[PDB]
Amino acid sequence: EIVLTQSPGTLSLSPGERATLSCRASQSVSSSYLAWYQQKPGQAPRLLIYGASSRATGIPDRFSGSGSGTDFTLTISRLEPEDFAVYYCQQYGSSPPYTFGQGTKLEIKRTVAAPSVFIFPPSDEQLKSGTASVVCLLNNFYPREAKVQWKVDNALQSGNSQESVTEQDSKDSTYSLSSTLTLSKADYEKHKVYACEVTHQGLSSPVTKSFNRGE
Amino acid sequence: QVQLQQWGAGLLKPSETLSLTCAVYGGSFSGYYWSWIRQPPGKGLEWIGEINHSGSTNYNPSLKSRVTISVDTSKNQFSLKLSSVTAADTAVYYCARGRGMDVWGQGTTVTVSSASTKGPSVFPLAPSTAALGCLVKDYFPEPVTVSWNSGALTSGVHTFPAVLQSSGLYSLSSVVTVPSSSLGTQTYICNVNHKPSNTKVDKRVEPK
């Protein structure tokens, strides 16, 4: 059983800087039995290397590979804007099943940007249906690592909020986050103040946006 | 230039069989390994199995009991068949040519859910710069297309990926940041299109 392992999970570098991705194997694998793939959101994986440093046909000369035994490395000498994708390594030609690595997401490196927080209460149209969804939005922030917490009457909520984040905006290299807290009409009409508190690196202190069921 | 073209049924009820087919056009057959791969939502890739000119069936032990791969030489095609599928098998499936693996198919998204097709419900997240949006809740299956002012407004728009609610239906939101001066000047309407339900909803978002 040969398992493959990639680190880091997220590499954040600027266009022009050199990128070095790693792949670690359980057993000892010959350098010719390793391959690399580049995949973008929505598209199929694009083969980069099929050996140690065997640059596949149609692959730019900036990609290279090295390694032996267990430690292998994919390398991009000079990053270009079309290189920020998700890279995988694969063991091919050794012991089946020929599994893949966990993947390494490449990210653009911009300065720290604090999110803009907004909170939307359930519209009067939705309350007539029997359910209520409160929305919290964090617009244009970097890095992606940020946490959001819901509080109904200053009580920590859990197990009832879902989350979604967009891809890195190709214009300002920032992210956007939306959290939906869903409650029945009765549980919504039970209590009064609803607050969404975000903790992010660009904030000197956690920022709360709240509304009261009435005002 | 070798090309691969896949087809098959995408939406399957649980506890039934999935059948996909892949056709190779512009390349040689035999000497290449015809492999299948699946990628779950938000996860990596999994190797399913491979086959060649003859019956070289080498599957994956994690799903070997329910997988069968066949090949047809008179049409240069190869088919994948899965049995007793569940919601865990929801993934994007690709066919590829192991040589590494050079050419990949376009992929087909296969979702397994006991839920039925239902049109979305659009509600307005009203403002109070500024931000406003639309909440598209309780629709199945994906996708839905959201625009603003019938394509006129595109800047500052963020449409978020859906989430599979516990009820089995999807829900997303599309927000947009606009200068607060236009709240009384500009009319903001979101257009939601759902092809699987054959539905379109124009929702006006006015300041509450």
Author numbering:
A (entry chain L): 1 to 27, 27A, 28 to 95, 95A, 96 to 213
B (entry chain H): 1 to 82, 82A, 82B, 82C, 83 to 96, 100K, 100L, 101 to 127, ...
Sentences from the paper on this structure:
The naïve antibody is often referred to as the unmutated common ancestor (UCA) of the bnAb lineage. The earliest Ab heavy chains from the lineage were detected at 9 mpi in the bulk HC NGS dataset, including a sequence with 99.4% identity to VH4-34*01/JH6*02 and lacking any CDRH1 insertion. Reverting the single mutation in this HC, combined with a reverted germline LC sequence (iGL), gave us an unmutated common ancestor (UCA). The UCA showed no reactivity with glycans on a NCFG microarray v5.5 (S8(C) Fig), arguing that the lineage did not arise from an anti-glycan antibody, for example elicited against a glycosylated parasitic or bacterial antigen that then developed specificity for the protein part of its epitope on HIV Env. Our study showed no evidence for glycan reactivity in lineage precursors. Therefore, it seems most probable that the lineage was triggered by the Env antigen itself. The glycine at position G100C found in the WIGEL motif is present in the UCA and only retained in 11aa-insertion Abs. This sequence provides a glycine hinge to the unique mature bnAb CDRH3 structure.
In this study, we investigated a donor who developed a family of potent HIV bnAbs with different lengths of an insertion in a critical framework region following infection with two founder viruses that were closely related and underwent extensive recombination. The bnAb lineage is defined by a CDRH3 length of 22 amino acids (aa), an IGHV4–34*01/IGHJ6*02 heavy chain (HC) and an IGKV3–20*01/IGKJ2*01 light chain (LC) gene. A greatly reduced ability for donor plasma to neutralize N332A Env-mutated pseudoviruses of different clades identified the V3-glycan bnAb site as the major target for PC39 neutralization breadth. Ab crystal structures show an extended CDRH1 that can help stabilize the CDRH3.
